[PDB]
Coordinates of C-alpha atoms in Angstrom, one line a residue:
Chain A
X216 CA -1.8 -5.0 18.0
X217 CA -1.5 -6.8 21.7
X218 CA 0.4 -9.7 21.4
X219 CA 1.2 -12.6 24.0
X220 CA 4.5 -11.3 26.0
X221 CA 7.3 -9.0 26.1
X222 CA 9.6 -12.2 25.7
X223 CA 7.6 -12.9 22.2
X224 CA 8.1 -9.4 21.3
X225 CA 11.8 -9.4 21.9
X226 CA 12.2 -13.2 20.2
X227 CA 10.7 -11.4 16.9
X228 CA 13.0 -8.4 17.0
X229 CA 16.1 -10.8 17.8
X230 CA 15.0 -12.9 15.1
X231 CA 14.7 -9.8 12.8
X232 CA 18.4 -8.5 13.7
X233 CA 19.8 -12.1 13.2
X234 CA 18.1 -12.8 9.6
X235 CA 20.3 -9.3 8.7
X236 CA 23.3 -10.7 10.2
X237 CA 23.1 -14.3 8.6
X238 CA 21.9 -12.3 5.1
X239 CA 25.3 -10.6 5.5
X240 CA 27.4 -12.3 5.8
X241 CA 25.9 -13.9 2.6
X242 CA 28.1 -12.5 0.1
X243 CA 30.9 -12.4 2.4
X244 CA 30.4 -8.7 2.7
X245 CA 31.2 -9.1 6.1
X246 CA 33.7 -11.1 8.9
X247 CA 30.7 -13.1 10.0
X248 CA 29.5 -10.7 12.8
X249 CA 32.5 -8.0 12.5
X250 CA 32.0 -5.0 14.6
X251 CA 29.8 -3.3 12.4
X252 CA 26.7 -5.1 13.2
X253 CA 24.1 -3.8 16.1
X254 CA 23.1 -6.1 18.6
X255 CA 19.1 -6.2 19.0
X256 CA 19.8 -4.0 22.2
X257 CA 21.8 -1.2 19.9
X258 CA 18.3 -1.3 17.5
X259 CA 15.6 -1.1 20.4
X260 CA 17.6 2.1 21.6
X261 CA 17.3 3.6 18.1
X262 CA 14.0 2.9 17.7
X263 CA 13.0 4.6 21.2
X264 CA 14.7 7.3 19.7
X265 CA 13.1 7.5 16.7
X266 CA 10.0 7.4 17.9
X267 CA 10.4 10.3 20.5
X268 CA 11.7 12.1 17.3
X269 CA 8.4 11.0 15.3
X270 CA 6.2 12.6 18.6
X271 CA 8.3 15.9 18.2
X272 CA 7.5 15.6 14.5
X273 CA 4.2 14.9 15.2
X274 CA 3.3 17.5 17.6
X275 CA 4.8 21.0 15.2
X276 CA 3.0 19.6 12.3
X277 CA 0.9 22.2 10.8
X278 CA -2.3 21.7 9.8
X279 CA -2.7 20.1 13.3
X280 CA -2.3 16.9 13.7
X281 CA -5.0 14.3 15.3
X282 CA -3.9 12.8 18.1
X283 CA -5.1 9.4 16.5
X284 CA -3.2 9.9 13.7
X285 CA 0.0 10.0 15.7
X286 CA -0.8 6.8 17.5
X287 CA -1.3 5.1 14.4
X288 CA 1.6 6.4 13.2
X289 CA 3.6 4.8 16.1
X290 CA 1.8 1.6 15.9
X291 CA 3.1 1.4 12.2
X292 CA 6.5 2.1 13.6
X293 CA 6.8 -0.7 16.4
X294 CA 5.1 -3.1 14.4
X295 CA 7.3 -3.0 11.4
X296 CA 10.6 -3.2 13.4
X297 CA 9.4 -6.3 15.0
X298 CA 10.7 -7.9 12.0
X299 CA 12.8 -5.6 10.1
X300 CA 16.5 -4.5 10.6
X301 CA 17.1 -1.1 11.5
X302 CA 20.5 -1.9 9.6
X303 CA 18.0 -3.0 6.8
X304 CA 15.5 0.1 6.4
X305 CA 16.5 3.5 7.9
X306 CA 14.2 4.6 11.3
X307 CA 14.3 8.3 9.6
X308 CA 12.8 7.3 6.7
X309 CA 10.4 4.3 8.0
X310 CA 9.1 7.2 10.5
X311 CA 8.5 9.7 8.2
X312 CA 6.7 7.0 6.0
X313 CA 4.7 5.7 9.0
X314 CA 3.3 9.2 9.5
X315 CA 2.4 9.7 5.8
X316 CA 0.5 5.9 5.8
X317 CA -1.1 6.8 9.0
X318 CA -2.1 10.9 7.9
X319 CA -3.6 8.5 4.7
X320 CA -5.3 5.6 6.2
X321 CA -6.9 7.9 8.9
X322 CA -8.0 10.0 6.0
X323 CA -6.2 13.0 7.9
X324 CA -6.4 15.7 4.9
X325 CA -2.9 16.8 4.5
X326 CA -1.1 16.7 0.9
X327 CA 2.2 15.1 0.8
X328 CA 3.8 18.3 -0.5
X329 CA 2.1 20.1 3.1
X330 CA 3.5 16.8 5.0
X331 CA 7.5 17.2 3.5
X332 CA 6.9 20.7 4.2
X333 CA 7.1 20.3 7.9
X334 CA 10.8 18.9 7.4
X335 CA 13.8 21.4 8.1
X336 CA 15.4 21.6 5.0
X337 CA 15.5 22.7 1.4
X338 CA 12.8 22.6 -0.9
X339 CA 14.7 19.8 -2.9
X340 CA 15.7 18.6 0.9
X341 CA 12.1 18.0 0.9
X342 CA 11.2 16.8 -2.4
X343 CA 14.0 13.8 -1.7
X344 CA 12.1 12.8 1.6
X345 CA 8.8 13.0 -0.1
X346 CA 10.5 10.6 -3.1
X347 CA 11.8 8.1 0.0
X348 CA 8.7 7.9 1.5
X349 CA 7.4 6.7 -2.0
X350 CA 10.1 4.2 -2.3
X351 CA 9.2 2.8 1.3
X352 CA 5.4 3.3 1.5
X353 CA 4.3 -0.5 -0.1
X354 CA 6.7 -2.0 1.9
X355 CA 5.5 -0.5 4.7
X356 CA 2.4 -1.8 4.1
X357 CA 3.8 -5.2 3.3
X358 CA 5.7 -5.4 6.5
X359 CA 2.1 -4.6 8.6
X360 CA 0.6 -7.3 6.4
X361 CA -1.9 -5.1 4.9
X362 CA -3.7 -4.6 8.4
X363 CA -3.6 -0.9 8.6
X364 CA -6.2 -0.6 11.4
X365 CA -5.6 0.7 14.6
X366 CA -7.5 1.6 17.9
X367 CA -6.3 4.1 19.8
X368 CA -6.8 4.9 23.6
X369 CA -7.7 8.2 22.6
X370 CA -11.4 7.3 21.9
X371 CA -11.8 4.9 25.4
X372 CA -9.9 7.6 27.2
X373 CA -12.9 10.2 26.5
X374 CA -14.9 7.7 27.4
X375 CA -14.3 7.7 31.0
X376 CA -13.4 11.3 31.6
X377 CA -17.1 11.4 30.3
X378 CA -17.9 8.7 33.0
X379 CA -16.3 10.1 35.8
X380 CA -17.3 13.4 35.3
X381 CA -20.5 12.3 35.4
X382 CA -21.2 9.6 38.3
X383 CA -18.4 12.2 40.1
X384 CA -19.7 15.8 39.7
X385 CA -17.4 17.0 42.3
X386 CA -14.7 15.5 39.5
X387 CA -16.5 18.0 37.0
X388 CA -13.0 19.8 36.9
X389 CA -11.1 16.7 35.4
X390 CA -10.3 19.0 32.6
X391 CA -6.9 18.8 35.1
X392 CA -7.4 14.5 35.0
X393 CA -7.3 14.9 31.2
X394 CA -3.8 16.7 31.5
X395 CA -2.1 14.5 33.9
X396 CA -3.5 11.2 32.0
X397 CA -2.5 13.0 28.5
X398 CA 1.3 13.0 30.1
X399 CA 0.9 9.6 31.4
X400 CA -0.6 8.0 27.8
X401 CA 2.5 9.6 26.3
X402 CA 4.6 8.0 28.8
X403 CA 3.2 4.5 28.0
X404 CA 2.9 5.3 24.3
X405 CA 6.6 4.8 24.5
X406 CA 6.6 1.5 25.8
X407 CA 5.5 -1.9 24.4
X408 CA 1.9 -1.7 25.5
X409 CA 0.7 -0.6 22.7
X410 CA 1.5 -3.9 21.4
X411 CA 0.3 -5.7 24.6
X412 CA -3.2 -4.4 26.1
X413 CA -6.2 -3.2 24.8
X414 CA -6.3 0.6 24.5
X415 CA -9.1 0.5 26.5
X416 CA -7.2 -1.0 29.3
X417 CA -5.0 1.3 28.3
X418 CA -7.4 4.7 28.5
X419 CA -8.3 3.1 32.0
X420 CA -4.8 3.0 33.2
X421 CA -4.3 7.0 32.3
X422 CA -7.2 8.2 34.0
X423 CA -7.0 5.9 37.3
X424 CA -3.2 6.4 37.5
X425 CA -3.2 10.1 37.3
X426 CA -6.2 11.1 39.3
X427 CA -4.4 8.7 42.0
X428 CA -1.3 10.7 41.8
X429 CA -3.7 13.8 42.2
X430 CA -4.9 12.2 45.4
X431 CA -8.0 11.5 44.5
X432 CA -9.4 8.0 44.5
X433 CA -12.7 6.9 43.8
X434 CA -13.3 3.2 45.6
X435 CA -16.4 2.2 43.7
X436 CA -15.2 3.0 40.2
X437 CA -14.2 -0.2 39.0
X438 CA -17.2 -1.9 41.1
X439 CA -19.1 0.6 38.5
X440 CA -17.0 1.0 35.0
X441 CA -17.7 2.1 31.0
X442 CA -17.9 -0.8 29.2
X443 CA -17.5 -4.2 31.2
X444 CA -14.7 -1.0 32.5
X445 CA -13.8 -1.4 29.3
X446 CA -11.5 -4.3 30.2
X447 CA -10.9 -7.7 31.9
X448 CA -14.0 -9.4 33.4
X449 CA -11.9 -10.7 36.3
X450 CA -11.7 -7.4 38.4
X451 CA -7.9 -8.7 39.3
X452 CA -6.6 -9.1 35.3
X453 CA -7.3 -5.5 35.2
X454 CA -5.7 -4.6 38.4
X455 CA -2.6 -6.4 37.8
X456 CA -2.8 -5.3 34.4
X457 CA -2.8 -1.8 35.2
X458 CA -0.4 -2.7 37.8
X459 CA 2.2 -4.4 34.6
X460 CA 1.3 -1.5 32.7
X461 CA 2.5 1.2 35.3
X462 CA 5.5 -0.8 35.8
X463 CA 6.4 -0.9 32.0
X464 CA 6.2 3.1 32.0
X465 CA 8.3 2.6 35.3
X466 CA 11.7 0.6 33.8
X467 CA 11.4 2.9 30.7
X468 CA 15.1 3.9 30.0
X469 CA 15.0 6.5 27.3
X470 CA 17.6 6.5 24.8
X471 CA 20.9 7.5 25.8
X472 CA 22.1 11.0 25.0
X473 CA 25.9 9.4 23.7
X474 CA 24.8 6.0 22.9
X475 CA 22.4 7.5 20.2
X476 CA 25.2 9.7 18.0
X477 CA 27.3 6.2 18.4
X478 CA 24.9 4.1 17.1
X479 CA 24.0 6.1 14.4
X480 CA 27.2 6.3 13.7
X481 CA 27.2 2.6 13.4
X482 CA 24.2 2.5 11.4
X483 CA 25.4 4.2 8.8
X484 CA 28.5 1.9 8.4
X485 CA 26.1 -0.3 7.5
X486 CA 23.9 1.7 4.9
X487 CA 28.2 2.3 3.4
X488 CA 29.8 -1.1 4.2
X489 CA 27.0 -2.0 1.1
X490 CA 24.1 -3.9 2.3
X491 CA 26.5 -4.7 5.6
Chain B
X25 CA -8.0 -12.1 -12.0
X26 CA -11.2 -13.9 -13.8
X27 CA -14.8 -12.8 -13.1
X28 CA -18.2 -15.0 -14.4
X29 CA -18.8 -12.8 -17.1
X30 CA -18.7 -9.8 -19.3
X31 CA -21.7 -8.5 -17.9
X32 CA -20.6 -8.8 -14.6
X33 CA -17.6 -6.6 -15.4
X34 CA -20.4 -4.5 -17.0
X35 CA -22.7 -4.1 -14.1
X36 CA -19.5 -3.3 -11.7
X37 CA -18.7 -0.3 -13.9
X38 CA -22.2 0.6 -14.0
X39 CA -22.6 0.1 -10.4
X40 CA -19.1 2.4 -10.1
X41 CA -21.0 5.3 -12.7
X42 CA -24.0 5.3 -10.8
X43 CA -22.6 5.6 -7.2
X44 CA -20.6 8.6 -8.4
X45 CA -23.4 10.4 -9.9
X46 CA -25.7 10.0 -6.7
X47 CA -22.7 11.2 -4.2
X48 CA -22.3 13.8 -7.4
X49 CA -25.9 15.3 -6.8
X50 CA -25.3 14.2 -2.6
X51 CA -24.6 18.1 -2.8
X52 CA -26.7 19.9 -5.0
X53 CA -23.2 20.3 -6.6
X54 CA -25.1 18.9 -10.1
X55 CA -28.2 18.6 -11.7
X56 CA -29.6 14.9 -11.0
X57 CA -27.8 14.2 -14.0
X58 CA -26.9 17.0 -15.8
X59 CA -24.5 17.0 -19.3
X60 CA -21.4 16.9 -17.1
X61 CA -21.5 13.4 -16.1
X62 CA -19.9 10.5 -18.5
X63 CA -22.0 7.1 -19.0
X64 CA -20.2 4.2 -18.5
X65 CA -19.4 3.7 -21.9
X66 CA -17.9 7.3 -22.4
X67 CA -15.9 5.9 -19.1
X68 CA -14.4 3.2 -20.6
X69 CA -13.2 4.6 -23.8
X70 CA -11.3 6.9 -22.0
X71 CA -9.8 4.1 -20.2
X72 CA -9.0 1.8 -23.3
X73 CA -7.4 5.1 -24.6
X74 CA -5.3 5.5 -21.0
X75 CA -4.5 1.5 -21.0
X76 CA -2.9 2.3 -24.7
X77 CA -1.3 5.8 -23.6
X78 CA 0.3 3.2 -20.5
X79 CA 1.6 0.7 -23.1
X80 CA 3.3 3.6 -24.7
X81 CA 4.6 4.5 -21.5
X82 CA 5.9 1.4 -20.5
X83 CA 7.4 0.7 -24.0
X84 CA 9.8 3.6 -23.9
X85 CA 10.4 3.1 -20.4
X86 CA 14.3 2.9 -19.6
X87 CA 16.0 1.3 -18.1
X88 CA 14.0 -1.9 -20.3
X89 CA 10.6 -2.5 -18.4
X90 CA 10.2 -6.7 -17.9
X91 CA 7.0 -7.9 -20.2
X92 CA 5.2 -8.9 -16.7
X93 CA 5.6 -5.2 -15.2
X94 CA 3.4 -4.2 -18.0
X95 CA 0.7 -6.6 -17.7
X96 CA 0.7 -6.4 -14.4
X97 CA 0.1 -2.5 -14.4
X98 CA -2.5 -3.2 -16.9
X99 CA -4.3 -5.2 -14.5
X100 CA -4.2 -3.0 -11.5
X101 CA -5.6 -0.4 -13.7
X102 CA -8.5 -2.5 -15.3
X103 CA -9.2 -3.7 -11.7
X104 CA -9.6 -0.2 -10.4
X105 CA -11.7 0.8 -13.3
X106 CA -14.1 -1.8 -12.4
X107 CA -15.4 -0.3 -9.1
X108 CA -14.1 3.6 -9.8
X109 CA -15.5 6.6 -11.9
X110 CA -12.5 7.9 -14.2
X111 CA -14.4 11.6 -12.7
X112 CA -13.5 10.7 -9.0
X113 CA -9.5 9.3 -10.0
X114 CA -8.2 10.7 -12.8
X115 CA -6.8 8.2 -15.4
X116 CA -3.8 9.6 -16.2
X117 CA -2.9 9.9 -12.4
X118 CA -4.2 6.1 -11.5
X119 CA -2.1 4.4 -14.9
X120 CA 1.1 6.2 -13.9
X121 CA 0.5 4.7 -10.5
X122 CA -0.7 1.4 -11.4
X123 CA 2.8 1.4 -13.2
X124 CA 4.7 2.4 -10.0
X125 CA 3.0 0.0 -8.2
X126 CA 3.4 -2.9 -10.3
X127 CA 7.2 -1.7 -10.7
X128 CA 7.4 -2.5 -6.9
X129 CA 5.4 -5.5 -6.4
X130 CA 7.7 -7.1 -9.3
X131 CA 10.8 -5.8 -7.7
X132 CA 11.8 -4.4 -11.2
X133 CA 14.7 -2.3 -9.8
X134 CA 13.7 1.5 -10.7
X135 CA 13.6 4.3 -8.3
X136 CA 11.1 6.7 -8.0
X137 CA 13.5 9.6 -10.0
X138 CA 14.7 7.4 -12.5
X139 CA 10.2 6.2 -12.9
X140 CA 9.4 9.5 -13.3
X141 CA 12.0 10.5 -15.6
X142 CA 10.7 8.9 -18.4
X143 CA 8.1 11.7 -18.3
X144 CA 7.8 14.4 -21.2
X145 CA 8.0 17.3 -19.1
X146 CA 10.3 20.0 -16.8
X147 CA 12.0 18.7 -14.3
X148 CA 9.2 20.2 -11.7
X149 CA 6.6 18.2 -13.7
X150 CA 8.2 14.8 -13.1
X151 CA 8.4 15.5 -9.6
X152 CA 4.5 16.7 -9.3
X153 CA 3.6 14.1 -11.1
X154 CA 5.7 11.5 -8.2
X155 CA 4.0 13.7 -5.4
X156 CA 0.4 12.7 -7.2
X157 CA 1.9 8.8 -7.3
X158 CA 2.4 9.0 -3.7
X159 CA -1.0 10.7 -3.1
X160 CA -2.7 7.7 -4.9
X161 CA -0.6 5.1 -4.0
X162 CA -2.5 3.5 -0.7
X163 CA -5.8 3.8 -2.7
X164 CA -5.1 1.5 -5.5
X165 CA -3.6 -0.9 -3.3
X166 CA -6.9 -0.3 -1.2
X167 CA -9.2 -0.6 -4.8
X168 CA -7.3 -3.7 -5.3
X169 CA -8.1 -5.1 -2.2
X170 CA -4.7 -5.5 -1.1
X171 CA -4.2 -8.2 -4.0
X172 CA -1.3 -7.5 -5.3
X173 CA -0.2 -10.9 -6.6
X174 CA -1.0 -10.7 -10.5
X175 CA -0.4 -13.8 -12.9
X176 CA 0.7 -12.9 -16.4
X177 CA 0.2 -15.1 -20.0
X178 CA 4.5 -14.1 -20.2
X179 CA 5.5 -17.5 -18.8
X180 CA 2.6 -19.8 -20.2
X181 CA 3.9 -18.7 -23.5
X182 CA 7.4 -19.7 -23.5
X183 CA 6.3 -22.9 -21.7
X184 CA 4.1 -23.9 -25.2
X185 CA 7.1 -22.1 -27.6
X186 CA 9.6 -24.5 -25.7
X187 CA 6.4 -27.0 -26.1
X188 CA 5.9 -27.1 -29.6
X189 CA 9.5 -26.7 -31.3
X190 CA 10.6 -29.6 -29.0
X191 CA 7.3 -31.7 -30.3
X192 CA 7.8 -30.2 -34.0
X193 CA 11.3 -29.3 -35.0
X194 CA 10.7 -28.0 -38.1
X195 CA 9.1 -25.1 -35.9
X196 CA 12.4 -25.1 -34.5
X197 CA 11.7 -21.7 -36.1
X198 CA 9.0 -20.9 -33.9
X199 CA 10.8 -17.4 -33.6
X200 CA 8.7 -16.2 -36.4
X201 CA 5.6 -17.4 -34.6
X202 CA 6.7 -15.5 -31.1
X203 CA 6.4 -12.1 -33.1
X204 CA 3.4 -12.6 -34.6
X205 CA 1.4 -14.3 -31.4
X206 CA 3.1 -11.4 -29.3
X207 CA 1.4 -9.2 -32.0
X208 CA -1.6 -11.2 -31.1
X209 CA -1.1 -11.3 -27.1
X210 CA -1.1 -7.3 -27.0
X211 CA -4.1 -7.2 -29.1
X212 CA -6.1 -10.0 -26.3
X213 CA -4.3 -8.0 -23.4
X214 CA -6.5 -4.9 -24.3
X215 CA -9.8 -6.6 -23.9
X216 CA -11.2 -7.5 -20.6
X217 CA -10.0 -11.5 -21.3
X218 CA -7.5 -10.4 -18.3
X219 CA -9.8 -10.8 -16.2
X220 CA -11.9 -13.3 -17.8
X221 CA -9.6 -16.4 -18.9
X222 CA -6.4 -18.0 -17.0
X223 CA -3.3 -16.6 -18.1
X224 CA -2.6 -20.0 -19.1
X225 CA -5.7 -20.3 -21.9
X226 CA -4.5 -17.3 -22.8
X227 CA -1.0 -17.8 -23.9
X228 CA -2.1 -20.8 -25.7
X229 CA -4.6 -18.8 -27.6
X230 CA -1.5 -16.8 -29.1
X231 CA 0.8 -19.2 -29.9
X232 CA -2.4 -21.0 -31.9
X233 CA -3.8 -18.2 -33.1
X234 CA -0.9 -17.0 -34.4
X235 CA 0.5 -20.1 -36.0
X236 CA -2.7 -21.4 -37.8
X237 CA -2.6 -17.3 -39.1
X238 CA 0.9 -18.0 -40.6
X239 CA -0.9 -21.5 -42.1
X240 CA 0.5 -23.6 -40.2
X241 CA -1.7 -26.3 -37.8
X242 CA -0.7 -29.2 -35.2
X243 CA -3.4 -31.4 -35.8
X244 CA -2.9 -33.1 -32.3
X245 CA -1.2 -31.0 -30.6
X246 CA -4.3 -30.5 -28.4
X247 CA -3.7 -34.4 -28.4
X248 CA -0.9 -34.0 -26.9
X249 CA -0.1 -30.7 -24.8
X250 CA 1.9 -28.4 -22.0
X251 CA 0.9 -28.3 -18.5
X252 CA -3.3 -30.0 -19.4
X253 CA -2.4 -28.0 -22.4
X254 CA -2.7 -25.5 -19.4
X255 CA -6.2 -25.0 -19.7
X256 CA -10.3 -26.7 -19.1
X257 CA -9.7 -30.5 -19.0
X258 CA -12.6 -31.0 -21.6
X259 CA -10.6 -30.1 -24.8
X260 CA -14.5 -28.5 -26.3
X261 CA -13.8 -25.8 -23.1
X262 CA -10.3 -25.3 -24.4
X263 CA -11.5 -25.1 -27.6
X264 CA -14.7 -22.6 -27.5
X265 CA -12.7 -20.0 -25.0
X266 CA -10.0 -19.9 -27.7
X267 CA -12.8 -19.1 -29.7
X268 CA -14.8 -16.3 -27.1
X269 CA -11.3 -14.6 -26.8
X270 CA -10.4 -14.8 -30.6
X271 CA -13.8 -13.0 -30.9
X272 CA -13.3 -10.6 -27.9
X273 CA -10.7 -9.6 -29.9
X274 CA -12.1 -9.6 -33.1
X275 CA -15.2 -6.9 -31.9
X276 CA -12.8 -4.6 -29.7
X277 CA -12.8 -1.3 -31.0
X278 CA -10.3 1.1 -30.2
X279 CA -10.5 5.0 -28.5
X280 CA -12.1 7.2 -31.1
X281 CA -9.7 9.4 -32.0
X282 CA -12.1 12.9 -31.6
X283 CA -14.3 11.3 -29.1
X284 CA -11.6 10.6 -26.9
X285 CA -10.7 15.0 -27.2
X286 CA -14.4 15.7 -26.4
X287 CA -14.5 12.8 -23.4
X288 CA -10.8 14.5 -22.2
X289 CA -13.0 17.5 -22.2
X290 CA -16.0 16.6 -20.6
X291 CA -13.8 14.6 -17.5
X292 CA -11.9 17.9 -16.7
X293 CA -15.5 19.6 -15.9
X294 CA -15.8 17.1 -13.7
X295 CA -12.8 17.8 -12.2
X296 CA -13.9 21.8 -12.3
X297 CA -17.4 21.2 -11.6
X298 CA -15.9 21.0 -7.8
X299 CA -15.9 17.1 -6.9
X300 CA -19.2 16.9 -9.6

């Protein structure tokens, strides 16, 4: 859910990676911050990778899977790492089990035996992720403090391809807008706005942005709108806003080809140098 | 936790029949109440006989179940009973999970495998029986409101054994009159005092009960006391709950032992009738 800042959001992770570090030091079970330890910036780069991994995930995943369900799903994911270690609960497994809440919550009908079954591996291979999930999935609910609702863009996305299409007729062929905003929701999917603007300032920002990039401009559409534009009163909070917005998809780094196989390399001296 | 009455926990399980049997004919999937359906009170004798088949299960448990895990799983259970039909979540599915649950809200260190593994069946059968866990998992914690936090009789008890062989040494040898008020606490945990009376009025009603059983009687104990004698300031309150629960008790009857066959029965054509 949107909170304040970025700064905020970045406080509450550091705070999450220090707790661990303090915590481990607590048994001396470590040289108080030895080399094993990830730095906030070494978890962030993880978790972006994680989460592209969840999309992938997401997107085989037979019987199809909702587009809602996969947004909840990475809500669960961002949310929980704001204040949990990734050297405390493993990405793999907290992804997997933020799929499984979200294919539940959003009443998605799939069976965890047809979920595990979408995993590369043995049947037992399987069976163990299916147990793991089961270990993490109250926790997971813990950690979101029992507030399992999300909105997704999604819903306020169809909204004004429905509105545009329609004071627009020319713009009756936005079955290419939908395409070109789908690849630019994605995009921002993968950034902190989830946790920042509405997802109807969110929707907004696909549409707009991409038929822009196609060109196209309508210079009334914002005097008009769908739902108050389904945003900001101030015309100028939702510019800038979509402005911020367009800038956070724009310093996106994804994660690092090299650094990844390091760091997980480093993670895992963590889940062996035992609870360190 | 503790409700008004009994006939408020009544009406709720009425209230939790009737709904079922409305969505049941919501179909055409039954006769508007055809032989298929259970009444409440064929619902709640297969319950008391699933709370009994859990204390088995937790008894034999290994590694050692804590006293609280127990009494908390009976709790989630009794909870979800009073606002589900045993035809839409099958009891023997919901204890096991109510057990799980409670194993993890307690932080009683048992995995999944080793939970499981205390099951009477193939190695395949444990693990179905986890992938059903994991199906019902979010639900109870949804039936239960997301109140998780249960308060058990456990600790009130050794507060008034410490109580009364520090007041009354000669009860120094009050580890005659644990057995017999534990005897007595099981007994009270099987009725719906759980969620009538305070934990605390509870555990005194054991360790009194019991005594006074075995002869013995403080004659100012009462006077005196542990923690408000941890229950109603007016000592006549104190006094006629001890009595309601020693009558709760005293009127409980146990799962018929055919009845219980027939109601198995007639609960799997439910579950055959198709969702009816």
């Amino acid at each position: 859910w949107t909170f304040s800042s970025e700064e905020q959001l970045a406080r509450l992770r550091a705070d999450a990676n220090r707790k661990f570090r303090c915590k481990a030091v607590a048994n001396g079970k470590v040289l108080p911050n030895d080399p094993v330890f990830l730095e906030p910036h070494e978890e962030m780069t993880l978790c972006k990778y994680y989460e592209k991994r969840l999309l992938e995930f997401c997107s085989v995943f037979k019987p199809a899977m909702p587009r809602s369900v996969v947004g909840t799903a990475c809500m669960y994911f961002k949310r929980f790492y704001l204040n949990n270690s990734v050297m405390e609960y493993h990405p793999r497994i907290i992804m997997l089990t933020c799929a499984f809440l979200a294919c539940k919550v959003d009443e998605f009908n799939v069976s965890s035996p047809q979920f595990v079954g979408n995993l590369r591996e043995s049947p037992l291979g399987q069976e163990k992720a299916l147990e793991q999930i089961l270990e993490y999935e109250l926790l997971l609910i813990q950690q979101l403090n029992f507030h399992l609702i999300v909105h997704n863009p999604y819903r306020p996305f169809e909204g004004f391809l429905i509105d545009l299409k329609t004071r627009y007729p020319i713009l009756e062929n936005p079955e290419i807008l939908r395409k070109t905003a789908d690849d630019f929701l994605n995009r921002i999917a993968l950034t902190d706005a989830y946790l920042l603007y509405t997802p109807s300032q969110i929707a907004l920002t696909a549409i707009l942005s991409s038929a822009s990039r196609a060109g196209i401009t309508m210079e009334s559409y914002l005097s008009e709108s769908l739902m108050l534009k389904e945003n900001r009163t101030c015309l100028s909070q939702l510019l800038d806003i979509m402005k911020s917005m367009r800038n956070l998809v724009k310093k996106y780094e994804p994660p690092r080809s090299e650094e990844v196989a390091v760091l997980k390399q480093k993670l895992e001296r963590c889940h062996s140098a035992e609870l360190a």
